[PDB]
């Protein structure tokens, strides 16, 4: 169990696949601009409550979503319609991230957590259209929520959900998170529900989708 709340580059594991690297940049977006971006994205983004599938069952995801990019992204057995026209603010942020981080992106997934009851549960971003060892950038706006990470068990332990290394990363207003290396191969992450009032949170997840 590790807690990370300091600006820095953290190598969270070195095996089995390789180096798992996460980079945190608090205050990447200044408070007032982040406030305005939040208001703007809450009003302008075409937010929808989408369906999931699981295993021959149907349910409403406990979060709103929207997609931007020229290529489709299919998770939870449902495909999101790619949007060719990026919102100008989203473009600007994309370009800012690229120039400052040195990594390029062509796809953006928008998550809106309406209140404390919204969440995304355990998964890895290992969809094959992301390629081998994808680079994923996460930018947060609104209320603070906790980004939890758990290391995957090795195949000898038959997927033991417990006792493996856990990491919690608070994502505050205007904080930028970068994930690279083996992070998607070796770790899972989620955003749990909370038990006290939370204001809405908008999260921007940038990635590269390949043919």
């Amino acid at each position: 169990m590790r807690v990370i709340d300091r600006e820095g580059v953290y190598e969270i594991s070195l095996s089995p696949t390789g180096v798992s690297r996460v980079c945190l940049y608090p205050g990447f977006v200044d408070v007032k601009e982040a406030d305005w971006i939040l208001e703007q994205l809450s009003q302008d983004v075409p937010w929808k409550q989408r369906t999931g599938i699981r295993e021959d069952i149907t349910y409403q995801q406990p979060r709103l979503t929207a997609w931007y990019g020229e290529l489709p992204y299919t998770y939870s057995r449902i495909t999101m319609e790619p949007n060719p026209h990026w919102h100008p603010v989203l473009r600007t942020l994309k370009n800012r991230i690229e120039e400052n981080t040195g990594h390029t992106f062509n796809s953006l997934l928008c998550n809106l957590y309406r209140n404390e009851k919204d969440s995304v549960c355990w998964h890895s971003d290992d969809e094959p259209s992301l390629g081998r060892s994808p680079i994923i950038a996460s930018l947060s706006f609104g209320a603070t929520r906790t980004f939890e990470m758990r290391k995957k068990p090795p195949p000898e332990e038959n997927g033991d959900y417990t006792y493996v290394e856990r990491v919690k990363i608070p994502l505050d207003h205007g904080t930028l998170l970068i994930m690279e290396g083996a992070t998607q191969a070796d770790w899972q992450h989620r955003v749990p529900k909370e038990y006290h009032s939370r204001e809405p949170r908008v999260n921007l997840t940038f990635r590269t989708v390949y043919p």
Partner: antibody, heavy 118, light 109 residues
């Protein structure tokens, strides 16, 4: 009673310069957007620049870029506009307007006259 | 050489319903502001966020959005409502701001 006062306007030769100032009275700057809008006699409004006082970000109009320089001093609660290489078409009434949000301007000044002519 | 245009005119009587439209194609935002300016005075803010009334604005003014078209409607024309109305086009964050063609509303005689 929360007014805005503009100063630094007058008469200048083409290619000359001016420095407009916008003093915030009754309230404060910071965590707000400071806009400059001009209006030629009998014409429509023309936004020329704004600045986000919290971070310092600035954006200018295409008919102004390179020549003007907008700034703000939280220490003095005063916005500035350094207008260089002034041209004849720059003659207009210049307004300074606040704007809680990033666009909605709620406090406007009375405006000062700027005449660029030989 | 001119930068902007002269405001268009609209002849209306007292009590009529006036609906001024503001076209902005390819718009994907609701951040449209409306302003009113009387002769010789600075403009005052009327509507922000396309439809939200500003503090101290009469309830007869109302703004709505229809796709890429934005509108400002006066339900009942009052004598103090005859002035020029300017539409601020969708102002995205980090991007420049543009004011539309003013609409001069004069009283019929």
């Amino acid at each position: 009673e929360v007014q805005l006062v503009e100063s630094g306007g007058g008469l200048v030769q083409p290619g000359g310069s001016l420095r407009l100032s916008c003093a915030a009275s009754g309230f404060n700057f910071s965590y707000s957007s400071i806009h400059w809008v001009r209006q030629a006699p009998g014409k429509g409004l023309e936004w020329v620049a704004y600045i986000y006082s919290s971070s310092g970000y600035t954006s200018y109009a295409d008919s102004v870029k390179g020549r003007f320089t907008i700034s703000a001093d939280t220490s003095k609660n005063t916005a500035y506009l350094q207008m260089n290489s002034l041209r004849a078409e720059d003659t207009a009434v210049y307004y300074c307007a606040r704007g809680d949000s990033w666009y909605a301007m709620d406090y406007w000044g009375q405006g000062t006259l700027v005449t660029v002519s030989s | 050489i001119q930068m902007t245009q002269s405001p268009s005119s609209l002849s209306a009587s007292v009590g009529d319903r006036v609906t001024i439209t503001c076209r902005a194609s390819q718009s994907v935002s609701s951040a449209v502001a409306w302003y009113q300016q009387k002769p010789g005075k600075a403009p005052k803010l009327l509507i922000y966020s396309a439809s939200s009334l500003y503090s101290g604005v009469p309830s007869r003014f109302s703004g709505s959005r229809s796709g890429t078209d934005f509108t400002l409607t006066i339900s009942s024309l009052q004598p103090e409502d005859f002035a020029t109305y300017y539409c601020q086009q969708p102002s995205y964050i980090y991007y420049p701001v543009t004011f539309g063609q003013g609409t001069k509303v004069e009283i019929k005689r």
